[PDB]
Amino acid sequence: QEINRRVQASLASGATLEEAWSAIPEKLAFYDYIGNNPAKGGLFRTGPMNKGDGIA
Amino acid sequence: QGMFVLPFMARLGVTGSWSGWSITGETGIDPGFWSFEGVALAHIVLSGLLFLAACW
Amino acid sequence: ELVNVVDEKLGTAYGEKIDLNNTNIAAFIQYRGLYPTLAKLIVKNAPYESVEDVLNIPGLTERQKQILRENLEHFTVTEVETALVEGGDRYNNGLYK
Amino acid sequence: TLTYDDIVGTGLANKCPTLDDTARGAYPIDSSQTYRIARLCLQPTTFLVKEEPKNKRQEAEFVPTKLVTRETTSLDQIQGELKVNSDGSLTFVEEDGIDFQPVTVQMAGGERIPLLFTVKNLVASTQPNVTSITTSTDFKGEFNVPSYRTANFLDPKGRGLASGYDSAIALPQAKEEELARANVKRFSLTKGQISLNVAKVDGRTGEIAGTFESEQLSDDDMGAHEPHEVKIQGVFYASIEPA
Amino acid sequence: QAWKGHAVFRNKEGEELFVRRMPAFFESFPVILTDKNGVVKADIPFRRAESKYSFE
Ligand code: CLA
Numbered sequence: 001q002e003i004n005r006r007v008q009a010s011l012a013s014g015a016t017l018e019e020a021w022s023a024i025p026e027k028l029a030f031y032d033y034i035g036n037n038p039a040k041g042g043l044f045r046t047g048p049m050n051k052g053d054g055i056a
Numbered sequence: 057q058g059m060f061v062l063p064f065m066a067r068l069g070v071t072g073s074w075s076g077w078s079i080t081g082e083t084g085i086d087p088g089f090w091s092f093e094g095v096a097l098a099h100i101v102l103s104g105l106l107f108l109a110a111c112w
Numbered sequence: 113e114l115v116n117v118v119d120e121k122l123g124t125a126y127g128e129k130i131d132l133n134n135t136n137i138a139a140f141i142q143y144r145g146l147y148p149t150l151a152k153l154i155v156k157n158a159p160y161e162s163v164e165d166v167l168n169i170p171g172l173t174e175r176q177k178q179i180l181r182e183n184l185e186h187f188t189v190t191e192v193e194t195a196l197v198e199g200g201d202r203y204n205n206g207l208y209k
Numbered sequence: 210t211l212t213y214d215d216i217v218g219t220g221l222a223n224k225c226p227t228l229d230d231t232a233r234g235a236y237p238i239d240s241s242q243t244y245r246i247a248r249l250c251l252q253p254t255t256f257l258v259k260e261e262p263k264n265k266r267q268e269a270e271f272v273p274t275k276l277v278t279r280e281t282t283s284l285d286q287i288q289g290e291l292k293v294n295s296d297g298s299l300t301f302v303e304e305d306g307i308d309f310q311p312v313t314v315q316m317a318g319g320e321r322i323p324l325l326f327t328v329k330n331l332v333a334s335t336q337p338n339v340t341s342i343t344t345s346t347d348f349k350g351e352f353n354v355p356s357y358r359t360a361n362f363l364d365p366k367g368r369g370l371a372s373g374y375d376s377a378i379a380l381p382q383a384k385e386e387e388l389a390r391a392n393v394k395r396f397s398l399t400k401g402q403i404s405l406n407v408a409k410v411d412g413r414t415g416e417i418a419g420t421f422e423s424e425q426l427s428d429d430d431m432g433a434h435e436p437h438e439v440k441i442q443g444v445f446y447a448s449i450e451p452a
Numbered sequence: 453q454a455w456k457g458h459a460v461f462r463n464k465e466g467e468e469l470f471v472r473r474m475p476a477f478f479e480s481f482p483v484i485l486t487d488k489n490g491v492v493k494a495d496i497p498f499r500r501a502e503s504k505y506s507f508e
C-alpha cells in the first residue's frame with residue numbers, strides 16, 4: 001500500500017513509470033516480500049533466513 | 057573404495073552378492089547362501105547366540 | 113533448451129481452436145452436429161495438411177460435408193504432437209468432470 | 210483346446226501358441242490374393258540390458274536381468290495386413306492389438322530397468338521371392354517406442370507434462386536452473402528394430418512359429434535420465450489367412 | 453574413470469624426453485625431463501631469469 005502510494009504521488013508529479021518505481025527504496029520493496037514474513041517457516045528448518053531463499 | 061573386510065571375504069572364496077554381481081565383474085551369478093550378505097548375516101546371528109551363552 | 117511441448121502448443125492455434133491433428137475428441141461437443149459421428153471420423157482419419165482437407169474423409173455423406181463446412185472456422189491444424197496423440201489420449205485423455 | 214477355467218492362474222495365458230515338430234512345411238503365397246495376419250503373439254523369454262560402459266569406450270555387452278513384474282510380458286492378439294510386394298517379398302503392417310507391455314527387469318546389484326516392450330506400428334518385411342513361407346523365411350522391421358509413461362503421468366512431487374505443477378513447489382525459493390530437467394517433462398519417441406526367424410510352418414493352416422530378437426530403448430522417465438539399450442529375445446506365433 | 457593413454461614427450465629436435473618420476477618419499481617433486489641417457493633436456497623452472505630448459 002505504501003509502495004503504491006509513493007508510486008502514484010510520483011506519477012502525479014509528472015514522473016515516468018521507470019522514474020516512479022526507481023524512486024522506491026530497495027529496503028521498502030524488501031519488506032513487501034513473503035520470504036521476510038515470519039509465518040512462512042518450519043519447526044525443523046534451522047538457521048538464518050538466508051539459508052532458505054538465499055542472501056538477498 | 058576403502059574396503060577392509062571385503063578383501064578377506066574374497067580371499068577365501070566369497071566373491072558374489074545375492075543382488076547378482078561378483079567382484080570379478082560377472083553378472084547373473086548365483087552365489088548361493090554364502091554371498092557377502094550371507095557371511096554378514098551369519099556373523100550377526102553368531103554374535104547374538106554368543107551373547108545369550110555369555111548371559112547363561 | 114528444455115520445453116514442455118504441451119504448454120508450448122497452447123501458444124499456437126491449438127490453444128484457440130479444435131486442432132484436427134491433436135485435440136481430444138470431447139472438444140467436438142462444443143458445436144452443433146460434430147459429436148460423436150463426425151468426431152470419430154475426424155480423429156480416425158487425422159492428420160490433415162489443412163483444415164479443408166477434413167472435407168475429403170472417405171465415405172462422408174453430403175450432409176456431413178455441409179456440417180463440416182459450417183465448422184471449418186472453429187478448426188485448426190498444427191503439427192502432430194506425440195505427447196497428445198499417444199496412449200489413445202485423443203479418445204480418452206484421463207479428464208472427466 | 211482349453212477353456213479360460215483350464216488356463217486361469219497357470220501362467221499359460223502369457224505363453225504364445227506353439228506348433229509341433231512335424232510342422233516343417235510350406236505355406237503357398239498367391240500374389241493375386243490379399244493376405245492378413247489374424248493373430249501375432251510375441252512371448253519374451255530373455256531381457257538383456259546393455260551395461261553403461263565404464264569409460265574404456267570398449268565393448269559394452271548386453272547382460273542378463275531378472276524379471277520382477279511376473280507373467281505380464283507378452284504381446285498378443287495383434288493383427289494387420291500382409292502385403293505381397295512386386296519383388297515377391299511380404300510386408301506385415303501392424304494395425305492393432307495388445308502390442309505393448311510395461312516390463313521391469315532388475316540388473317545385478319539392484320538397478321531396476323523399466324521399458325515399454327512393444328511392436329507398435331510394426332512394419333516388417335521378408336526377403337524377396339517368397340512364393341511359399343518356409344522355415345527359411347524371416348521378417349525384419351522397425352517399430353515405434355513411445356514414452357513409457359504418457360503425458361498425464363505425475364511424478365511423486367505432482368509434476369507432469371499435460372498435467373501437474375511445473376516447478377518444485379516444496380522448494381519455493383530454490384534457483385530453478387538446476388531443477389529444469391526434473392521440472393520440464395519431455396515425451397520420448399524412438400525406434401526399435403525386430404527380427405522374426407520362422408522355425409516352424411503349418412502349410413495347411415497358415416500358422417507359423419519361431420524365435421524373435423528385438424532391440425529398443427528403455428524408460429527415460431519423461432526426460433529425467435538416459436534410457437538404456439534393451440535386447441528382447443523370445444518366441445512368436447502368427448496365423449496367416451486370406452483377407 | 454579411464455586411462456588417458458601413454459604420454460610421449462618430445463623436444464623441438466624430435467628427441468624423446470622422459471619425465472623423472474616422483475619417489476614415494478616426496479610430497480612434492482620437481483618436473484624434470486631427460487633424454488634416454490639421463491641428460492637434462494627440459495624442466496619447469498622455479499626462478500625464470502636464468503632458465504635454459506623451459507618447455508617454451
Ligand atoms: C529463547 C530461546 C532461543 C531462541 C528463540 C533462539 C533463536 C535463534 N537462534 Mg539461538 N540459542 C539458544 C536460544 C535461543 N535461540 C541457546 C540456549 C543456545 C545454546 C545451544 C543457542 C545457540 C544458537 C546457535 C549455535 C545458533 C542459533 C541460531 C538461532 C536462530 C535459528 C534457530 C533455529 O533454527 O531453531 C531450531 C529449533 C528447533 C529445531 C526446535 C527444537 C525443539 C526441541 C529439540 C524439542 C525437544 C522435545 C523434548 C525432548 C520432548 C520431551 C518430552 C518429555 C517431557 C516426555 C534463531 C534466531 C542459529 C543462527 O542462525 O545464528 C546466527 C545458530 O547457528 N542459536
Ligand code: CLA
Nearest residue numbers: 060061062063064065066067068070095096098099102106
Ligand atoms: C564359526 C566359524 C567361522 C567361519 C567359517 C568364519 C569365516 C569368516 N570370517 Mg568370522 N568370526 C568367527 C567365526 C567364523 N568366521 C568368530 C567366532 C569371531 C569372533 C572372534 C569371528 C570374527 C571375524 C572377524 C573380525 C573377521 C572375520 C572374517 C571372516 C572371513 C575371513 C576369515 C579369515 O581371513 O580368517 C583369518 C584367520 C586366521 C588367519 C586364523 C589365524 C590362526 C592363528 C595363527 C592360530 C594361532 C593359535 C594356534 C593354536 C597355533 C597352533 C596351530 C597348530 C595347527 C600348529 C570369513 C568369511 C573377516 C571378514 O571378512 O569379516 C566380514 C574379519 O575381518 N570373522
Ligand SMILES: CC1=C(/C=C/C(C)=C/C=C/C(C)=C/C=C/C=C(C)/C=C/C=C(C)/C=C/C2=C(C)CCCC2(C)C)C(C)(C)CCC1
Nearest residue numbers: 090095098099101102103104105106107108109110111112
Ligand atoms: C556346524 C556348522 C557351522 C557352525 C556352527 C556354529 C559355529 C554354531 C554355533 C553355535 C552357538 C554359538 C550356539 C549357542 C548358543 C546358545 C545358547 C543356547 C544359549 C542360551 C541361553 C540361555 C538359556 C540363557 C538364559 C538366560 C537369559 C537369557 C538371561 C538371564 C538368565 C538366563 C541365564 C536364565 C557352519 C555355519 C559353519 C556351517 C555348517 C555346520
Ligand SMILES: [Ca+2]
Nearest residue numbers: 344345407408
Ligand atoms: Ca529359419
